[PDB]
Design a protein around this ligand. Structure first.
Ligand SMILES: OC[C@H]1O[C@H](O)[C@H](O)[C@@H](O)[C@H]1O
Ligand SMILES: OC[C@H]1O[C@H](O)[C@H](O)[C@@H](O)[C@H]1O
Ligand SMILES: OC[C@H]1O[C@H](O)[C@H](O)[C@@H](O)[C@H]1O
Ligand SMILES: OC[C@H]1O[C@H](O)[C@H](O)[C@@H](O)[C@H]1O
Ligand SMILES: OC[C@H]1O[C@H](O)[C@H](O)[C@@H](O)[C@H]1O
Ligand SMILES: OC[C@H]1O[C@H](O)[C@H](O)[C@@H](O)[C@H]1O
Ligand SMILES: [Mg+2]
Lengths: 151, 150
């Protein structure tokens, strides 16, 4: 069993989407911020090892990858969806500090770091911590109710 | 139903029911002790998102602030008790490595030592520091962290 949830950008109220909102995004489709809510921006978290797991797009089964699948992606590495499952797509959903951390230690950011980015803004990896990289994980039926993604 | 050990990060001691009984009486103190055995295994029963009950596996008793108050003061002793209610809600913060009560204070060793001796009591205190950090590990591998939210 896996709780279905929305990944909500705390500062803007926007959500993580595959660019274009497809039920089956092509491999390497970018992960962007968008204000819309619908079935094709639902996500699930597939726990792999304690805190580490795959951030899975619910509609397609593709998971979030740093583009290129490198072990230690540099700052500004774009985030995309890809079907492959391996250790470089491992993230942890820190619901206490409200962020999404990659196994190599960087966080998911809006590209450019705005607290209030436009729709379709890309998301990237970056080592910095500030309030524009905060995310909470909420019920698809109530965007203000936090849900436990680890069950 | 994952079973885990609650390991005091700085010393490597573990939370025990005082006395090591598989059947601790109500209001038995939670203490730190170096020994490992099934009578110090814990479970976590999720109630509401991050909040749940910290449960002594062998007895089913859960962790309470002594007195069951909703907003216990600093130095309130932590004990085991069978009752289930909202004043016994905790979250297991495995990212910052601490155990936080619903009202915002944390589980500490009494006195705040990074190396508390065996039988040191545990208490609630609002401060954050190295000596109140806990990690949650596998009974078959005291260095492998396990997910308690299950
Ligand atoms: O790029 C993301 C964006 O794509 C499409 O335009 C959809 O219609 C939107 O709802 C959103 O999912
Ligand atoms: O872009 C991400 C994607 O592409 C890489 O080159 C890898 O081969 C895949 O496993 C996946 O990580
Ligand atoms: O692209 C993401 C990046 O954008 C800006 O440069 C910010 O200052 C960084 O902290 C980070 O958020
Ligand atoms: O108080 C804790 C302590 O209690 C008893 O002495 C047990 O033998 C120990 O292993 C430990 O559980
Ligand atoms: O020691 C804790 C204990 O405190 C009170 O007496 C309550 O009535 C119990 O439910 C329990 O919480
Ligand atoms: O007993 C608990 C308490 O002990 C000391 O006062 C420490 O300074 C506090 O930070 C706390 O750990
Ligand atoms: Mg119960």
């Amino acid at each position: 069993h896996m709780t279905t949830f929305l990944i909500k950008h705390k500062a803007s109220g926007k959500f993580l989407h595959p660019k274009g909102g497809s039920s089956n995004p092509a491999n390497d489709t970018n992960l962007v911020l968008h204000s819309d809510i619908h079935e094709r921006m639902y996500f699930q978290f597939d726990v792999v090892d304690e805190r580490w797991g795959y951030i899975k797009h619910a509609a397609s089964g593709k998971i979030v990858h740093p583009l290129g699948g490198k072990a230690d992606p540099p700052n500004e590495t774009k985030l995309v969806l890809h079907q492959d499952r391996h250790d470089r797509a491992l993230f942890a959903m820190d619901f206490f500090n409200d962020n999404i951390i990659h196994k190599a230690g960087k966080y998911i950011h809006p590209k450019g770091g705005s607290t209030n980015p436009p729709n379709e803004t890309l998301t990237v990896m970056h080592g910095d911590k500030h309030k524009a990289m905060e995310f909470i994980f909420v019920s698809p039926k109530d965007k203000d109710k936090r849900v436990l993604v680890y069950v």
